[PDB]
Design a protein around this ligand. Sequence first.
Ligand SMILES: CCCCCCCCCCCCCCCCCC(=O)OC[C@H](COP(=O)(O)OCCN)OC(=O)CCCCCCCCCCCCCCCCC
Ligand SMILES: CCCCCCCCCCCCCCCCCC(=O)OC[C@H](COP(=O)(O)OCCN)OC(=O)CCCCCCCCCCCCCCCCC
Ligand SMILES: CCCCCCCCCCCCCCCCCC(=O)OC[C@H](COP(=O)(O)OCCN)OC(=O)CCCCCCCCCCCCCCCCC
Ligand SMILES: CCCCCCCCCCCCCCCCCCCC
Lengths: 470, 100, 504, 55
Amino acid sequence: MTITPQNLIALLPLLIVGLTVVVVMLSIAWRRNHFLNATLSVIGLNAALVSLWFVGQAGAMDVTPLMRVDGFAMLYTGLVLLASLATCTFAYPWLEGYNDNKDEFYLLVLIAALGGILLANANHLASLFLGIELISLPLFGLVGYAFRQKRSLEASIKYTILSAAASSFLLFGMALVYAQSGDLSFVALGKNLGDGMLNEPLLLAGFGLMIVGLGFKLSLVPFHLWTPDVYQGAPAPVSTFLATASKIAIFGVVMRLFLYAPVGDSEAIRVVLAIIAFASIIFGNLMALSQTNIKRLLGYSSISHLGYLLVALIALQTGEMSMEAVGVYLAGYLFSSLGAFGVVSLMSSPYRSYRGLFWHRPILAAVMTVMMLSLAGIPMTLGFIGKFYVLAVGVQAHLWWLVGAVVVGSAIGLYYYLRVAVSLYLHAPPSNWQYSAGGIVVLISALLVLVLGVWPQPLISIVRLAMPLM
Amino acid sequence: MIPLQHGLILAAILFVLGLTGLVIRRNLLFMLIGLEIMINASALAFVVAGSYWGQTDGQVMYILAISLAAAEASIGLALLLQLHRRRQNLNIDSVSEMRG
Amino acid sequence: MLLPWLILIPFIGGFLCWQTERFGVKVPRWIALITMGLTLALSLQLWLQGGYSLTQSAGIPQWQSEFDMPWIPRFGISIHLAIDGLSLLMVVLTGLLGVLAVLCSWKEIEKYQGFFHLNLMWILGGVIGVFLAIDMFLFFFFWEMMLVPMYFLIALWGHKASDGKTRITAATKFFIYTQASGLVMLIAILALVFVHYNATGVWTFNYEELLNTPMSSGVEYLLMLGFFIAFAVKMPVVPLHGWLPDAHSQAPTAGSVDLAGILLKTAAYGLLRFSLPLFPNASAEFAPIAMWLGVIGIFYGAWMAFAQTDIKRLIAYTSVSHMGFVLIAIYTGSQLAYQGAVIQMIAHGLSAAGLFILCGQLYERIHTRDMRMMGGLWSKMKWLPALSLFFAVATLGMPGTGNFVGEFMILFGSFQVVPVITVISTFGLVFASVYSLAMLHRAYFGKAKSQIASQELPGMSLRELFMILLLVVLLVLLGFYPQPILDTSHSAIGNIQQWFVNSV
Amino acid sequence: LLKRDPLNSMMNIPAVLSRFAGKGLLLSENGYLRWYVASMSIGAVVVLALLMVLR
Ligand SMILES: CCCCCCCCCCCCCCCCCC(=O)OC[C@H](COP(=O)(O)OCCN)OC(=O)CCCCCCCCCCCCCCCCC
Ligand SMILES: CCCCCCCCCCCCCCCCCC(=O)OC[C@H](COP(=O)(O)OCCN)OC(=O)CCCCCCCCCCCCCCCCC
Ligand SMILES: CCCCCCCCCCCCCCCCCC(=O)OC[C@H](COP(=O)(O)OCCN)OC(=O)CCCCCCCCCCCCCCCCC
Ligand SMILES: CCCCCCCCCCCCCCCCCCCC
């Protein structure tokens, strides 16, 4: 299929972010200016976020034998773009203290955002693979951006080796799937099977290797052991981006792949993902019980939240609001993780103990305790709305083991989240507008969490508007 | 007249051999070598799958595979170079400071 | 009409308490006092204008006042409030206990009194919203939003003599118990809503619509079990009870947190309002297990209360025993036992509020809570030992106090239903008298067993004596004239009892 | 006999079970990259075997 001007206007955030990559690269080639390159990157990401309006007025259509644009793609593109914008905003005061070159950071953030947009728009195995790699490799650079530090270099090496292994696993999986089916489109993965013979062994093994790669990319048990180390060792804006944008884009493409494929309603795949989600929730909540480090704690939190996401994933073909639950939960999780990792970044900036935070930084302490109440699914917070959606979807499809796992993991998460949120207020022994901009970002994130936890109807209507093709 | 199953078996054998070399070797260079073996075996499987169906999609996926392999080898060898420059060893078990 | 203002006046009052701290350190206590004064005035105005004594039982639903607003129209969720006799009585009790909680912490001139007052008002607003909401999602929302300020008050403003880690552990255990039970309740609510949606095809969370829902036997049992697990954690019912002495031990020294949301019995109201009408056959099947749990709770709480060397834990276990009495009353299916349960909850709230206030005063004078470090305090204090004697005689079920009236109507209805549980519960009343006498004589009688108990102590303040004597007068008037309270709640009790016995 | 609240310990038994399970599960995070790759291959074997058994 050729490309039309309507297909070009469907390509608007991808083209805008790519043009931003080229412009920022040429500006770095002209003269190394941190402020101007950061401003150009933020301008390009905001331009793509604005041009999502024109993409929405363009309608839902198919641009490539690879790409499909609908409201689902707009919602995930907007989430990825917002996460990238917050990552740049948090990264500028951190990069104010970096002795080496700071301008490549925003180039890598823009390329990873480009990969996230491609993963949001992906309707093909090639686009899935290229979006995963386009997210992964700039994250290899960003995790080891402070390569002089021991922890950052260790996390970069671990992430690079493990993600190369997961990329090979995923690629061999789609190789087996394409050997079985003969078409790499999402809709044709198992379309040549009928009369109850959907569980062909080669297709199931290829999808299993794809599950191995994606469950690495989604921090799902037992491909989750990288998450606390890579989260801790990486810089805190990089931890923010890796927690929000990569996970959201990869889960969106997994959502689209399991909706569109005929093999997605297989019983064996459903049971395997049920086991993975159960173990992910239980293990991620249990392993964060005795964590004194905030970053590893939030990595195990990411594992648990992705387990709740997979619980919402499993009931896709049976329930009707599974995608709506995933969208509401992902908006809430983006806001909560953005706020928490942003306060962590603002306390880690510039590049050179959360106890007693209220006595010198009260606003950041309030924002942190709002997000740790949000990640626990406490009412008046958007994470509660997401957990309620997950529980409703689990109750509809009679996923009782998953529902009990969500309740037990919620209790354990309540324990450690409240431990940190109340360690904030105990007793223990800047001056630029970009730090204030990061503070405004985390403050609006906390206000959004509180308002959409009290009044979740506009977000529900927005997510219900983001309906993919049938 | 070449069976598809034999080519897929060869690709799987090279894939699991690359994984074995990735696991059992402490040296980061040999793990990078094993990763190259795994991704090249996956590219071989995709080429065989494309050749059975008479489609260019297998070779296109091979091209994407080797683009990823080249860039990943570049990044991994840069990380290995910095590890050898500041640590004077390639023992991947020595870099284990972050745990628990 | 006035119900949204009844819920929202504590929240606006708490926001004003936090904001008006810059005007002075002695300002937020006055703001909280006028806030609960307005709340209690509105509650008494609803009592006067409701005409509850002339209201006859017409069947569920029958609300004396009603408010509705769409909140989440996607799920059919509405802010839907409704007040009737039982809800109005518990709202009046909430307002009075909030007035007592504000007056009990009058001498705290701490530099962060605004947040303490705001958390107290948010707790009281959550309790009022629990007593007023007839929407399942809104009721659960209030049920879980009233626990965060309790957690922060226990953890940060709690017992200053104890270590911080004990306060954190007690607050975390209380929060984990209450919120896990609430999540089980939310699962039961969601499954009931999905059953109704599959049966009819409309999205609703309204409790009036969910009443006529056809459920198979066994699914209804599971939903009732989820509701009862939530209410059994919050009541408390054994073994879901240790959070109550743990939170009472590490509570703030004034005792306002006890009066705010802990001592108000929302769980038994939920059992009367939601567990019995929505699942009548399941509750009829579950009645022996629940009432034997109540018997075990009465005797377990009595044996724990006798064995405590701490006053606060002792009063918490008295609360456990009296809630076991109420739990026995709830599953009888008798109008007399239900009216006695209502009287018992109100009288227990009053008596335990007086006991906790006086325990706070006694700890203020003697700077300890161990009963082995005191004794013979009748000669060393002016007003406190006699009022504590009156309250300890009140909680053992003495006529002239409302506890006797409530417990005896409970036992009359229960004996009309089942004799064995009634006779075992009356021996539980003997046990209650035993622990009350043990507390009285270990605390105020004998010789001084330490040095701080052998010195003269200053008398109680005029405001504190005023509120204690107000509690005394209210308990005496409830003991001798409980009739207006009985005619206030006669319609709601009649509707609930007729729905329970006419659908089984 | 009951002054130590046996039912409180009975319901606190899940808390110590969760603590023990978390302490045992944290031993898998030894920080070694080769063990991480081995765990990924173990998960691949387990997922593939479960998919073949349930097919
Ligand atoms: C009627 C029974 C059936 C229905 C049950 C419904 C559920 C709600 C009612 C039961 C709740 C039981 C909760 C028990 C634990 C209470 C929390 C607690 O004790 O926290 C304190 C403790 C830490 O205290 P400490 O030991 O001082 O710490 C220093 C050590 N470094 O913290 C810890 O040690 C860590 C706490 C981790 C999180 C709590 C444990 C969660 C367990 C699963 C919850 C769901 C219940 C499932 C069924 C359990 C069996 C009945
Ligand atoms: C750790 C804390 C949480 C506890 C673990 C998580 C919850 C576990 C719940 C287990 C439920 C087991 C159900 C087993 C039978 C399922 C199949 C079945 O019989 O379905 C019947 C029915 C579907 O058929 P339908 O045509 O809709 O018939 C309408 C019938 N009224 O089905 C329906 O209409 C829906 C049936 C729903 C049943 C109730 C589920 C929730 C009940 C409350 C929570 C569990 C019980 C309380 C806590 C226990 C101790 C922790
Ligand atoms: C980290 C580790 C530690 C923490 C975690 C510990 C474990 C957490 C999970 C514990 C709960 C496990 C699941 C319990 C519910 C099982 C439900 C079940 O099996 O239901 C089967 C059946 C469903 O009903 P059905 O036959 O479909 O009805 C329609 C046709 N008549 O049901 C029926 O027919 C009715 C069955 C009734 C009895 C089963 C429910 C028992 C509930 C026990 C707790 C409450 C006990 C009572 C109250 C005590 C005080 C609160
Ligand atoms: C919810 C709070 C309840 C507090 C206790 C109230 C007990 C009832 C008191 C009623 C008043 C008794 C004394 C006055 C009697 C007036 C009789 C008028 C008609 C003859």
